[PDB]
């Protein structure tokens, strides 16, 4: 928010701010959030959940017949 | 005959751009890979009706030179439609394994063919219901390399046998 | 109360339910344009937009009536 | 069916064992299954013969006292519900039971042969199995 | 149902004694680093290296990394 | 026996005083630092005699210690701004807790699980780094 | 302060949301003593916030795997796996169409060159300079750069217009928009022209959509074995796009209603004698972007102190902590739920789609032309498919 506030309160190159000017520069920060914190970070959490391998499973075809529901 | 003639069929009716280009690409492969061993002939007479018989010995006398010939027919589009002649060709089948790819292919090939989609689809269905053993070779492969190697290896087997 | 021959269920035609979805989006823009000033103060624009409330109620109250009938 | 749907068997035993009758009499084998719900209990709504012959497919052995074993009873409910090496009938059922014993050792060798045969009864056919009791 | 969620998820924190030791070694390494490198900054209450938040001690810097890990 | 020197030297890092450089605690701990690095070298040399030429990380730590103890004890002065040199060569000692990653066959199996999971998200951590660049 | 029970289940809800949990910890170190307080707050952040992400991620992840195997959700995936088969085999069947004055003399050799493998590595070695020309524009950059990089648009805009022609007047206007990134190429070539014109009429803000051409460097993945994994992600994201767009729009109709409701309660009431904060509720653009602070949950704290002293103080006006609690609790876990369902449904599809290529194109045909390291998600979602 302190970067949103400065990015809104913006006037020109080598000029001090002016509050609530350029309030349309808050679209750069909702399009950034919808992409990187919401979408992309949840691609990382989901490529690790989806592609997670059991630590060690080398017990005769991993207990050839008896498996997760069958063994436990 | 000395060498069994090569005749291609299966996508759709000949004359349509789809089957025309399919066969012409396959024959370009045959030429530029086997350059100096196969002579390509274009046929405009109805072989099934055997000037009709004027070209049959012409095919023979290129087939009577210990060399393979590819038959660019333009009226035969069925295995049973040539079950009567004594040519005994090798029937390589350029197979399409789904109607949907067929409609997409014909539609994507301009708009002049788009007015003839239904008839080509019907003839392709008719070909599909034909029994598989009526074709000497099956080519349902997608990549040019795969079907080219398949046909090349079969022709190589024939050439080593004779 | 349950009287048939509504002649109202026939009114739920597709030209009729895309004007309610048009008055709602219009309504959602009037609410978007209002600015809230501290102590009974009102901007001149927000005094104009307060004149549309009888219309938006007029349409939304029409729908309840025509639906509780149909 | 999972370990969730199996603690019920531990629970439902308690209301009719009352810390005493672990050799529980076999009348409850129908009563217990109706009380419970699928996928462990048969259920009280539709006990239909094709549904119930799963219990006949679950050829639980009986002793001289018309009694069953808690450990043995628990496995047979598992084995039919999870379709673990379940055959249609005949000695081919026991042919897979040899594996049913064998597979256990390579996983849990800590079990003896009695408790192996407790987990895999391999009932002898001439005895009236629980399924055969109610099939007759 | 609240106890099985707790039981199931705390049993699987007991099957991974070493996964919460690479994380406790990340917090160890950084801590040490912050000590030698950031340890002699003079505390100024205007800044965020306060008397509360600093690198002057192992536990004073382990709290700085936990305060920072939790996004604060 | 090595693995306890690893875990006793890594606590000699957590006890040092960052501000009071020459406190009495730091004077003792700078006698331990010779003892701990003496063990590591005579665990490296016998290892490199009996194996021939992770072990780079061990190699760096022992050299970084000797170089620090050499140029500080030998002269320590007469070079431009060389107090910062040992102060930046002793930050290599922080790698001593990292020597235990491969000494424990079960901790190494967890480190190789993080690395193997950093390679699954790597063709998306390049798309992420390219969208974050646009 | 934990004065009451209602003042304590809000000071501890603040710390679990991990907003300002250190000012709470640093107050009770001054007030009481810094020896025992850490036993209250570290076990509270770990259990309350970290250990509840583990449960929420786990409970959600299992729920998304049980729903992927619903009959209504396999039926709509096999209908996606099918059109991927058609498109895959049709590509080979369009490869066979390999036809061997200026109507047929230039348009024959152009499309020969402009599809050659030395052409791609020219454009992608020339879009890797356009994305390093606009990567060095800093502030106060030397005067030679400002002019040098000023021509660097026109050299690149003109040249990328040159290759926009060879794909149009050498391969076809109608037969120009059949590829995805080929439509992307048009999207920014007109877009880059728009910046040029718009900057002459209004010098200043130059948001500059010509670095969007850097998205063609993603096609360097085609030369790697990581194209199937990545194309199947976009193929799955594009198929389920009317359900992501109509799901970002229900996450926007609940930001609006809330923003609206936030103006009714705190509109015009943030005129404090210090000055109205930047996180107002007075106008709609400022009410939307402070509900977006509370949803993403960062400094929902400070917006609540203003919203409490707005309606009174720590007094008859602290009933307004319900707005900032219901809204940072149902946006902390509703954005995670929505945006992880989008990223798990469309990412477990791109894991079976890229697996039914290797398991056909390298297992099914390679034979008929003559487990095995399955993750926990893959095994458990196959036992759930076999019921
Ligand atoms: C495929 C991904 C990587 C593309 C990401 C870019 C777009 C999705 C976003 C990112 C930044 C956004 C822009 C950020 C700011 C502005 C300026 C805004 O208008 C202004 O403020 C310009 C004039 C002025 O400053 O007065 C109009 C929307 C726009 C172009 C936004 C439109 C959407 C953009 C291009
Ligand atoms: C998932 C877990 C089991 C992995 C291992 C634990 C870690 C998550 C670390 C990161 C933050 C660490 C904490 C950061 C700060 C402190 C305060 C510290 O406090 C003191 O010694 C005195 C008071 C002060 O901090 O000033 C005691 C250790 C402790 C609780 C640390 C214990 C170990 C923690 C929880
Ligand atoms: C808590 C233990 C079990 C952890 C494992 C490591 C310990 C066996 C040893 C290894 C090195 C030891 C340190 C070596 C030297 C010193 C200096 C010693 O003397 C002082 O500096 C005190 C001076 C004063 O009284 O002001 C205080 C303990 C301490 C930090 C020792 C604390 C205990 C340590 C960490
Ligand atoms: C090929 C692409 C993907 C990467 C290109 C490199 C840029 C991402 C970075 C790397 C180094 C950066 C430079 C590092 C240091 C400086 C000095 C600094 O500027 C000054 O020296 C201040 C005075 C002035 O020149 O205005 C900031 C800009 C600049 C040129 C940076 C500009 C952007 C650069 C070239
Ligand atoms: C406050 C004076 C008028 C400001 C007008 C700004 C218009 C653009 C608003 C952008 C922020 C709202 C984004 C909505 C979607 C999240
Ligand atoms: C749910 C917490 C709200 C706080 C309300 C404070 C009440 C004090 C009187
Ligand atoms: C046929 C297109 C292939 C593209 C290959 C690279 C794709 C990388 C993933 C792109 C994800 C974009 C998400 C944008 C934000 C919603
Ligand atoms: Ca925060």
Residue numbers in the entry:
A (entry chain A): 1375 to 1446
B (entry chain B): 227 to 276, 301 to 412
C (entry chain A): 76 to 145
D (entry chain A): 1736 to 1871
E (entry chain A): 1592 to 1663
F (entry chain A): 1158 to 1210, 1222 to 1302
G (entry chain A): 291 to 390, 460 to 729, 772 to 788
Kindly provide excerpts from the paper associated with this entry.
Voltage-gated calcium (CaV) channels mediate calcium influx to cells in response to changes in membrane potential. The so-called pharmacoresistant (R-type) CaV2.3 is widely expressed in the brain and enriched in the hippocampus, cerebral cortex, amygdala, and corpus striatum. High-voltage-activated R-type CaV2.3 channel plays pivotal roles in many physiological activities and is implicated in epilepsy, convulsions, and other neurodevelopmental impairments. Here, we determine the high-resolution cryo-electron microscopy (cryo-EM) structure of human CaV2.3 in complex with the α2δ1 and β1 subunits.
